[PDB]
Amino acid sequence: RPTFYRQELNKTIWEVPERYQNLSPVGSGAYGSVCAAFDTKTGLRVAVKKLSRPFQSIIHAKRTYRELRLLKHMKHENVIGLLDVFTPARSLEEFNDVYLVTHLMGNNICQKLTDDHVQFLIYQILRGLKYIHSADIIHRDLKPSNLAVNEDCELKILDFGLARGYVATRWYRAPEIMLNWMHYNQTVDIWSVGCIMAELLTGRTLFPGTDHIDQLKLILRLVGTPGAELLKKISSESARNYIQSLTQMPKMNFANVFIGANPLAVDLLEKMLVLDSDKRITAAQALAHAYFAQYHDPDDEPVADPYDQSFESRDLLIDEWKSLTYDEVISFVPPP
């Protein structure tokens, strides 16, 4: 057991091994806080996430276990990976706190904004999402503040998950999940990618809605109102009656909206930003789109090892989720 030390940052106590130094706050929300730091065992910059009161409720405890399990499993160049996990506790009996560590990579709109760099950035997002989806995980939260990039334009997907330069989750959300239209699939995340790629091409947020009603209004102005075939798939009656009450909107010509852009970029956006999630392109199909010809390699776009989510079905007490989390802390082995 290393020697720990204590300090207070923004009214939050941090008790961490002495190898982690110069802690500097990055972000904070209801569920936790993140600091940047230097790891003197390696000479590298890291980020440390402290969960707020991880075992104070069932929701907290199960979220804590969910995140540690998933982060321990993620082993992909375009997804966050876990360098370390630790607790100042010396026994289960005083286990009250959880800290997670990753290498510090840091979007904020990589040096130049060329079509080449948009290609590479969106390519890496799709490559990481193919991996995440193959583990039967839906991100649900994709947005520019959940992407990490370095000076070489390499990118990783993460999820702060803190309930935190303003970037609203709703701006990048697919309408079927934002408004509980229907049972939704993994391509909700592809909608978010389309929104991100559009912003990289135009310099502005595609759909900056101020609430869910305005968000839907902005979306339908581009993609048009649902026709009769999709309305029949909107199984929520309240949502269907609302949409049918609206002034109908035509689908816009994307070549005019994104004037000046690579025609292959426009075509890809046309396949991502479609209301019908049965027709929206998947991450693996998008990787094969001609926009990515200079990066796509179907032999270097790997999938995840199988990921056991049977714990999600279990209805457990705080102290049981706590014990399972402690098991996972104790068994962690840092990568090479």
Ligand X SMILES: Cc1ccc(-n2nc(C(C)(C)C)cc2NC(=O)Nc2ccc(OCCN3CCOCC3)c3ccccc23)cc1
81 is in an annotated binding site: no
Nearer to ligand X, 25 or 227 (CB): 25
Nearer to ligand X, 68 or 265 (CB): 68
* Pairing of β 4-9 and β 12-17: antiparallel
Q: How far is the CB of 45 from ligand X (least distance, A)?
A: 8
33 is in an annotated binding site: yes
49 is in an annotated binding site: yes
Nearer to ligand X, 19 or 240 (CB): 19
Q: In the structure encoding, which two tokens stand for residue 167, read together?
A: 């970037």
Supply the DSSP symbol for 150.
-
Q: In the structure encoding, which two tokens stand for residue 168, read together?
A: 């609203």
- Please answer whether residues 269 and 259 qualify as being in contact, where contact means their C-beta atoms are separated by less than 8 angstroms: no
Binding site for ligand X (CB under 6 A): 26, 34, 47, 49, 63, 66-67, 70-71, 74, 79-80, 100-102, 104-106, 132, 137, 139, 148, 157-161
Q: How far is the CB of 158 from ligand X (least distance, A)?
A: 3
Amino acid at site 310: S
Chain breaks in the chain (C to N over 2.5 A) after: 106, 109, 164
- Please answer whether residues 226 and 234 qualify as being in contact, where contact means their C-beta atoms are separated by less than 8 angstroms: yes
Q: Which residue is nearest to ligand X (CB)?
A: 161
Q: In the structure encoding, which two tokens stand for residue 165, read together?
A: 């330069």
57 is in an annotated binding site: no
34 is in an annotated binding site: yes
Which residues pair with residue 34 across a beta bridge?
27, 49
Amino acid at site 301: E
Q: How far is the CB of 311 from ligand X (least distance, A)?
A: 12
Kindly give, in sequence order, each residue whose CB lies less than 8 Å from that of residue 318, ignoring residues fewer than 6 positions away: 55, 56, 57, 58, 61
Q: How far is the CB of 104 from ligand X (least distance, A)?
A: 4
- Please answer whether residues 250 and 168 qualify as being in contact, where contact means their C-beta atoms are separated by less than 8 angstroms: no
Q: How far is the CB of 85 from ligand X (least distance, A)?
A: 9
Nearer to ligand X, 73 or 219 (CB): 73
Whether 159 is catalytic: yes
CA 68 to chain centre: 15
Nearer to ligand X, 84 or 181 (CB): 84
69: left (phi over 0), alpha (psi -120 to 50) or beta: alpha
266 is in an annotated binding site: no
Nearest-angstrom CA–CA distance, 168 and 309: 29
27 is in an annotated binding site: yes
Q: Which of 39, 84, 159, 189 is catalytic?
A: 159
Residues with catalytic annotation? 159
Binding-site residue numbers for ATP are 26-34, 49
